[PDB]
């Protein structure tokens, strides 16, 4: 009776020490602890039971040598829903980490949602998120960035292209949208004084501030044009300007400086003028001399092949030369230019021979008729219509 | 109690057929090997390694939730290592899966699929501090960045509305609708919305032709290299009005076409005025003619034409500012070689005709002249005077 | 002797085999291993002890059947800070994975910082990062991308909008910023030959290379305008052009082709000219005939309602027709156009009656005075004013 029996159930009240292998073929059921100085193994399932305190696995750090960690680590499954206090939303938490702080944890809250928190930098190879993305800090991309949706910036300086010494960028300052440039070597900085293009956010009016060059034509459909402070409409100078029929490309307003002898010999020149004086009145008048070829400005007006005309103004290249203007008109139905005619002005007056008038002095004519009187020197000759009589008076 | 084989022997191997209950500390110094289970009501510890063996069913660790109190979880959790490559069915790509989670659904899992690649799936929101990915990135949902976004490569949008800058009440954005690329604006307070009626700038995607639809202002000059210009429906080329316009030599900046309204006496007193006309009538023919009076100073338009310092001329047109005033035109030409403007000359027209003294013609009436020669006949009243060239005689007829 | 006692401490030197349930109610303390062929369970805590070598848990793969994994997996807690060698920065590492490679690990380095490394693709639903973002490879977004800060590209081709057959993009090639277009069907490719708009990064000067259209008006504040090689300023043609007072919208330079009888019958026409000949000199002169209505160009100059004038030029639509120019001036204070006056030119010379001069032949006048001599045929008549005499001479 004070020995243990091998055939029936017994209760051992002494402390046993087993020096040989122990073999079990039925459940081991303990109400206390289990320390093993060697490794341990179980089949299929290991369960950590909970009787009021959260369950955990602890990985000891061991001695500070070899491949051992600096701190012990643990896996703990816990919560605060039943904790009674400010926060009770962390329903189920699977937490990993060490003596200092957690490394990471996954959790399901009361609302049923799952979060996987990392207390540092996550370092994946690839990322593939099926839902949203939020990043509070600066983002950097090593290659292209493609979106099926819209790119949106809430920064004034919104979109920037950097290359070489210069940064170009789009800036919305709520009043206007600017296309701006940086100083050389300040690619990430602010804008310089240049204002290449801007758009008024309210009116849509565009302003270009550093000059504009256009190729292949400009058309203003409405509102007209205002220019400060000059317009150079420079026509196409060809050798055949005198006889060149207009085309749809050459109609319109323009000017050409014809300064080459080969061409302006074909155009009208100016006239040498001689100043003469009336012996009687002392009033001067100009008399036309020889035609002299001269360079000049050819100017065209009119917008269609029906409506087109030209002015030819000569300019002096010699100290004694004078300026004379000429005009012509395009004749579509005749398919030719009208002949140049001289413009009459104070420097190129019409001549008595040009209009069919009698010269003021030294004149010769076929016949003349006088009604009231004819004075010769001091002798007046007066007809008397009532009778058939003439009177010779003198003073 | 009788045979000595009904007690356990202490020196040799024994087989116990009774259930032992050990109430004191038990000490082992050799392997414990069971073919059955192990329940401990207290904690457990082992050295170096814990192994969960597999004999046909996947292995797991279970963390029980316990009573709903203190720091306990609402649900039990488990770590399970499993797969489906040998499962026999639709999917056999999940070779090795390390899964953590609870009664409801998994929290996360890492897996190596059959092609050998590793994936780490999170059934919710991953919440790191920093992110550093050595490879690709894909996001199916909306993305938001709290500060700048910098790329060594190209930003590419496949949206019609592709790039938007929002500030204050306005959103500006670039829109490619496949036919044209637009720079557009939103209504005030609709920064993320669609475009209004405004069309600031657009580009034809096929021709590259640009259309500006809300007006254009330019500074520091414009040049059209080709194609010319067409304007609807007027052009105001506004010249620089200075005090010395009368004697001002042209410069490379002032050559070209323009007009100036010279409306200040201080300046137009220097310019030609208009002439007063008096309408007189020939007693004989009854036909009227205009005779020039006094010159009267007047404001006017000065217009320049010509594009170079060689080729340049001006017209001066006066306009009336008094009820009886008249309009007269004048012309001049730039003389480079002489370095001066030619003097203004009067333009002759129906309202400002040339005078007989201007052209050297005899007045139609009350005229006085040096000498005259008549060839055929001279009539005075009713008396004709006719030369006979063959003889030396004149005859007097009635 | 040599049976086990059940009331006092005993040492068992034989290998016991327990075929029935074993019940413990006090600590089990082993210096060796523990294999269980069934499941295992403990309360509250399981601890893996470390005596010089890193601790781990192993999940066996089992037979290749059912839901078993292809490879065994393990959790290992280790480090290299005390390893003595090239790298000692991995202080505490919690690593999970298999024989081929690690699946993932979290680590605290010697600097105290935490990293969570994933040896593959991380696949979350949502992402919410409180700090920075870096991606070395290509990135793709399925919807919109919004930044509170600036978007910056360091690529030449910086920003691209793709739709339909065409890709539009902004390109900074360090010298100039271009707005470029792709060939049809090459949306991700390079630019074609088109050059819609460019901006010089140094000067800000804009160049448009494929033509320009403007609506609602253009204003050049400075620098003027230069055009190659013509300007068509097309005025607004209305039915009341003859009497139409200018408005602020119609002042300025333009031309109109008035080709409809309903309108040009109101304007001056041209004059038929007849060629006459001086009986004495044989020199021809032109005499004015009938006025014939004709289409023409109406051209306006001047920029204000004070400063404004027009020229009216007629063009021939019939073989015998001639061209005549006319002029008028806007009289603001009188609120009317001055009446059209004829321009005198070689083709439309003034008539003797227009200027008050005596015709060169067959003339009639009121009175005449001669000072020097009067010749009639062969008879000279010479006054001698001093002594009061007349002389009758012959040639």
Author numbering:
A (entry chain B), C (entry chain A): 894 to 1288
B (entry chain C): 890 to 1287
Verbatim from the authors:
The long tail fibers recognize the outer membrane protein C (OmpC) or the lipopolysaccharide (LPS) of E. coli and are responsible for the initial and reversible attachment of the virion. The carboxy-terminal parts of gp34 that we crystallized occupy the part of the proximal tail fiber closest to gp35 (the “knee”).
Crystals belonging to two different space groups (P21 and R32) were obtained for gp34(894–1289). The structure of the R32 crystal form was solved by molecular replacement, using the hexagonal setting H32. Four trimers (i.e., twelve identical protein chains) were found in the asymmetric unit. For final refinement at 3.0 Å resolution, secondary structure restraints were used as without them the model tended to get distorted.
